Amino acid sequence: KPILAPEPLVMDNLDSIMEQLNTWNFPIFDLVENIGRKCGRILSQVSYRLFEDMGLFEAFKIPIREFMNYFHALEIGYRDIPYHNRIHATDVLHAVWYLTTQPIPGLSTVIGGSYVFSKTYNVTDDKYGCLSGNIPALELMALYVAAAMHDYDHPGRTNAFLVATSAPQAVLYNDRSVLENHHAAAAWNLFMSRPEYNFLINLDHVEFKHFRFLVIEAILATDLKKHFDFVAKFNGKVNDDVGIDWTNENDRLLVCQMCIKLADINGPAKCKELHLQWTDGIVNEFYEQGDEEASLGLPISPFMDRSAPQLANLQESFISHIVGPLCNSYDSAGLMPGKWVRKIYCQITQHLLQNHKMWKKVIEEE
Amino acid sequence: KPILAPEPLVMDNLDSIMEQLNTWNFPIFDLVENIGRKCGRILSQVSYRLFEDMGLFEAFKIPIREFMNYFHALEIGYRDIPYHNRIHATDVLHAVWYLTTQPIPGLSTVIGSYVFSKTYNVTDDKYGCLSGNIPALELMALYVAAAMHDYDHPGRTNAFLVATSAPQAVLYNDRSVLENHHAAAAWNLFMSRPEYNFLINLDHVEFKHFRFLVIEAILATDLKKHFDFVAKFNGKVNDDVGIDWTNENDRLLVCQMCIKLADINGPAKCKELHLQWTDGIVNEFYEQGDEEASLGLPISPFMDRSAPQLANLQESFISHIVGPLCNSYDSAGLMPGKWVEGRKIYCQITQHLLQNHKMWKKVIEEEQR
Numbered sequence: 170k171p172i173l174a175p176e177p178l179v180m181d182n183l184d185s186i187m188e189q190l191n192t193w194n195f196p197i198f199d200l201v202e203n204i205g206r207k208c209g210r211i212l213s214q215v216s217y218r219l220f221e222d223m224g225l226f227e228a229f230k231i232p233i234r235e236f237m238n239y240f241h242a243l244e245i246g247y248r249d250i251p252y253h254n255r256i257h258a259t260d261v262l263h264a265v266w267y268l269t270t271q272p273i274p275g276l277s278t279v280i281g282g283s284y285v286f287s288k289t290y291n292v293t294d295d296k297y298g299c300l301s302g303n304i305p306a307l308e309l310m311a312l313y314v315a316a317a318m319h320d321y322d323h324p325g326r327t328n329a330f331l332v333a334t335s336a337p338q339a340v341l342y343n344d345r346s347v348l349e350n351h352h353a354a355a356a357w358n359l360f361m362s363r364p365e366y367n368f369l370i371n372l373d374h375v376e377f378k379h380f381r382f383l384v385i386e387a388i389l390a391t392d393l394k395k396h397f398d399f400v401a402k403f404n405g406k407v408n409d410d411v412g413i414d415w416t417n418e419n420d421r422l423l424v425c426q427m428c429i430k431l432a433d434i435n436g437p438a439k440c441k442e443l444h445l446q447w448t449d450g451i452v453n454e455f456y457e458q459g460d461e462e463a464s465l466g467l468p469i470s471p472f473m474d475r476s477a478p479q480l481a482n483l484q485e486s487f488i489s490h491i492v493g494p495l496c497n498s499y500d501s502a503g504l505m506p507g508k509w510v511r512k513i514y515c516q517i518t519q520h521l522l523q524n525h526k527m528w529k530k531v532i533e534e535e
Numbered sequence: 536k537p538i539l540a541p542e543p544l545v546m547d548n549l550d551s552i553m554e555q556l557n558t559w560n561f562p563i564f565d566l567v568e569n570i571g572r573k574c575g576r577i578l579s580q581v582s583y584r585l586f587e588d589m590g591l592f593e594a595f596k597i598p599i600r601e602f603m604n605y606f607h608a609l610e611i612g613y614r615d616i617p618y619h620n621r622i623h624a625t626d627v628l629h630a631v632w633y634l635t636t637q638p639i640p641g642l643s644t645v646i647g648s649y650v651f652s653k654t655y656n657v658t659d660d661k662y663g664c665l666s667g668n669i670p671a672l673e674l675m676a677l678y679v680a681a682a683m684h685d686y687d688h689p690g691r692t693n694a695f696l697v698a699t700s701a702p703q704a705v706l707y708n709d710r711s712v713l714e715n716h717h718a719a720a721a722w723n724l725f726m727s728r729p730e731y732n733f734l735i736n737l738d739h740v741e742f743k744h745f746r747f748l749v750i751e752a753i754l755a756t757d758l759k760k761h762f763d764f765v766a767k768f769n770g771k772v773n774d775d776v777g778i779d780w781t782n783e784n785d786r787l788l789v790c791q792m793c794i795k796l797a798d799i800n801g802p803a804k805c806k807e808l809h810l811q812w813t814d815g816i817v818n819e820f821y822e823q824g825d826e827e828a829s830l831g832l833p834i835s836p837f838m839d840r841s842a843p844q845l846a847n848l849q850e851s852f853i854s855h856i857v858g859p860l861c862n863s864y865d866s867a868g869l870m871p872g873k874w875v876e877g878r879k880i881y882c883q884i885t886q887h888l889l890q891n892h893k894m895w896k897k898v899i900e901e902e903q904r
């Protein structure tokens with residue numbers, strides 16, 4: 170039986186929270202409370218609003234019922250686990266939308282046809298552009314769909330755990346990007362399983378194949394084992410003879426991959442209150458894994474032992490080794506949203522710096 | 536439910552054909568006839584002989600029963616299709632063994648674990664062999680990879696699976712669809728039963744590294760990655776150190792080139808073997824072409840039985856794929872061969888390839904006049 174979207178497709182009572190999607194520190198946990206914690210509708214409701222904000226329904230003649238059917242089925246297959254749940258998917262989708270639609274100081278834009286723009290884009294100053302002016306709508310839509318799908322049916326275990334235990338999924342994917350291959354494959358399988366889910370019906374065959382390829386490339390880019398390769402490749406392309414060439418499809422793909430990568434690990438670049446809640450989630454998953462490791466007679470992985478937590482060290486090293494260099498690379502390309510204030514004020518990097526200082530201070534006291 | 540190796544594990548009346556495993560043009564189709572078509576034993580019988588020739592049973596304290604159990608289950612899961620069958624697996628395994636055991640002119644043995652064929656004399660000074668440069672564990676992974684590398688092939692190409700949204704293409708996100716499946720299904724089979732655990736005396740570290748090598752070798756057989764492997768190899772050959780046999784990544788790359796060459800060895804065999812293999816592959820292509828038509832898709836190049844271009848297919852396959860791969864492998868100085876007495880080397884493999892290329896060219900000339 171198909172999982173179909175519930176009640177009236179669009180919920181009416183969420184208007185005041187949804188108007189604040191144009192903010193970086195979107196109060197996603199307030200939205201969760203407003204909807205109901207295990208209601209299973211947050212992803213489809215946010216997705217509807219963002220697609221409508223971008224005019225993507227008109228751009229691709231997307232039937233809304235099938236769109237909501239699919240995004241509801243998708244959200245239902247995110248498990249009720251502390252971090253890799255439908256709330257995290259929604260968060261990543263919101264982050265890729267922000268990064269691609271919000272004003273970027275001194276970015277040059279194609280328009281200001283095959284491009285779409287957010288209704289929240291109000292600056293008419295030529296000293297501001299946005300990524301959606303440089304990346305065609307089809308490719309942007311793939312990125313958004315990828316974000317919604319990117320952790321589908323996550324089991325609450327890391328790739329290394331699946332591999333070390335010879336989990337059926339690790340055997341199936343030959344130890345290579347096990348979770349990410351699964352997310353993409355299971356979400357695509359879900360999509361093709363029912364005509365009630367076919368919201369892409371008005372793409373031609375060529376468009377559809379290219380869309381599918383972009384979605385897969387974006388989802389597979391979320392494997393952190395490939396992190397340093399993506400960052401080196403991006404830094405290489407930024408510092409060459411011409412820089413990012415927006416007319417080159419491979420350059421655009423690489424930009425989209427950096428975008429979804431940053432969106433996926435956005436937590437440490439949010440306000441303290443959001444960052445801390447998300448952090449609680451991730452470590453609760455780690456601890457569940459640690460318990461399973463112990464019961465299997467394996468050594469408990471670093472930072473996964475609930476009876477010897479090293480929260481501050483985890484967050485500090487994650488920021489210094491992963492998020493920090495990724496933000497620096499993205500910022501050096503001049504792709505970070507921000508405001509002119511001759512100088513630029515960038516909220517995202519400011520938050521990251523503040524959160525890094527906070528964890529450092531905790532480490533000093535310990 | 537366990538598929539077990541049948542009757543006496545080693546069939547006893549095949550020593551006349553098996554003695555010829557040391558020949559490149561091994562008469563594999565005569566062995567098929569000798570054993571019985573769809574007896575389902577060719578792969579396990581040859582595997583046993585080559586593992587014994589190398590002393591791998593002693594080297595890894597491999598129990599023979601479990602080894603034969605696994606290789607029999609494996610061979611049973613190769614389908615009765617014209618090309619990607621247990622006979623092709625056996626052929627690829629023979630080819631990797633030949634390439635790794637046979638004298639190679641002017642190859643130096645690594646300074647400073649290793650196994651040697653009973654067919655290799657230590658008195659070779661102006662000759663070496665790959666098995667002297669690649670540790671036994673890694674060699675065994677390559678052999679096992681060759682046996683597994685087309686397991687449960689459906690007789691369709693990756694592009695067909697992808698174009699038709701086959702369940703496997705969706706499962707593997709359109710990336711090396713068949714090759715991922717071969718490796719995953721063969722490993723799953725292996726792990727499914729204790730009766731198959733011939734690797735029981737590897738420690739955990741060894742086992743994990745073995746599994747990694749097997750997967751890397753199998754995944755290297757995807758021709759979509761062909762030019763990448765060849766460029767990478769040519770890059771490594773033409774830099775400051777060349778191949779460094781003490782470097783694990785260089786050795787992996789050598790093994791991948793080996794299995795790649797072994798997999799497409801057909802055009803580099805004698806005309807008799809080449810043409811039989813060719814018949815097999817084009818029969819698979821034509822079955823696919825029929826399915827394409829019935830699905831309303833465009834028939835892929837060279838897959839339309841009612842407008843064959845066999846000669847053009849084989850000529851372009853040799854000139855664009857096999858030829859550059861052989862040239863790369865030869866440039867590394869890894870081709871088996873002999874010194875010409877009375878500076879130069881005679882290489883049987885490249886000679887065959889050149890003869891087969893000329894043959895198909897001649898056929899092309901007749902067709903268009």
Ligand SMILES: Nc1ncnc2c1ncn2[C@@H]1O[C@H](COP(=O)(O)O)[C@@H](O)[C@H]1O
Pocket residue numbers: 253319320391393433434436437447448451483484487
């Ligand atoms: N705040 C954080 N602290 C530590 N690891 C994190 C944090 N946020 C994300 N990660 C890791 O980053 C990766 C995100 O991948 P995923 O969420 O599965 O798409 C995983 O390896 C997470 O464990």
Ligand SMILES: Nc1ncnc2c1ncn2[C@@H]1O[C@H](COP(=O)(O)O)[C@@H](O)[C@H]1O
Pocket residue numbers: 619685692756758798799801802812813816848849852
């Ligand atoms: N004689 C041949 N002519 C054309 N294509 C070939 C020939 N031999 C091998 N191939 C191709 O090589 C690919 C890789 O070999 P395999 O992994 O055994 O399928 C096959 O899928 C075929 O398309």
Ligand SMILES: [Ca+2]
Pocket residue numbers: 408409410
């Ligand atoms: Ca430069």
Ligand SMILES: [Mg+2]
Pocket residue numbers: 319320348391
């Ligand atoms: Mg993930």
Ligand SMILES: [Mg+2]
Pocket residue numbers: 684685713756
């Ligand atoms: Mg193959």
Ligand SMILES: [Mn+2]
Pocket residue numbers: 257261319320391433
């Ligand atoms: Mn994620």
Ligand SMILES: [Mn+2]
Pocket residue numbers: 623627684685756798
């Ligand atoms: Mn093959």
